[PDB]
């Protein structure tokens, strides 16, 4: 259980009250976007949190550079295989945790992000269950 706090994920923005609209349940537990491995959607297909997939909402975007430090807050730092970062659905970078427990405050540097408006999906794969955690970050790269 955990989520991306900077640049803020969609669930982070819900939890911070930064969205103009009601996100529902997710605003009370941004750490909980858990779903089976292998998805490339913002909710991972977790039906409690389908709002996270809705691109029609006016999701706030964060202005970032092409290289950016991305920070997770983990409430339950499960043993981890990989952290996979996708840009608009395509795999961009992979960080190998080698089956180890990550720190509860974890920062990864993403580089070579394409300029303009994009959505980064961070997929956190748990090494000892079939679940991953799904975090979308709407960004404008310049
Ligand atoms: Cu968890």
What tokens does 4 get? 């991306």
Length of the chain: 142
Q: Is 1 a known ligand-binding residue?
A: yes
User: What approach was used to elucidate this structure?
Assistant: X-ray
Given a contact cutoff of 8 angstroms between Cβ atoms, the answer to whether 11 and 57 are in contact is no
With the C-alpha atoms ordered 86, 87, 90, 96, is the resulting torsion angle positive or negative?
A: negative
Q: Which residue has the tokens 């991972």?
A: 44
The dihedral sign for the CA sequence 85, 31, 8, 55: positive
Resolution of the PDB structure in angstroms? 1.5
Residues with CB under 5 A from ligand 1 (ion): 1, 76
108 is in an annotated binding site: no
Per the structure, the count of domains in the chain is 1
CA distance 53 to 10: 9
Residue 9 is part of which domain span?
1-142
Ligand 1 center–CA 55 separation, angstroms:
26
CATH number assigned to the domain comprising residue 120: 2.70.50.50
């Amino acid at each position: 259980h955990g989520w991306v706090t900077d640049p803020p994920s969609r669930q982070a923005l819900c939890a911070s009250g930064e969205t103009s609209f009601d996100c529902g349940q997710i605003s009370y537990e941004p750490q909980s976007v858990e779903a089976p491995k292998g998805a490339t959607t913002c909710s991972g297909g977790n039906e409690a949190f389908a709002i996270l997939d809705d691109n029609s909402k006016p999701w706030p975007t964060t202005e970032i550079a092409s290289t950016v430090d991305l920070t997770w807050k983990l409430t339950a730092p499960h043993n981890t295989s990989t952290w996979e970062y996708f840009v608009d659905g395509q795999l961009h970078q992979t960080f190998d945790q080698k089956g180890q427990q990550p720190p509860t405050s974890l920062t990864h540097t993403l580089t070579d992000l394409p300029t303009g408006e994009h959505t980064i999906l961070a997929r956190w794969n748990v090494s000892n269950t079939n679940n991953a955690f799904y975090n979308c970050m709407d960004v404008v790269v310049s």
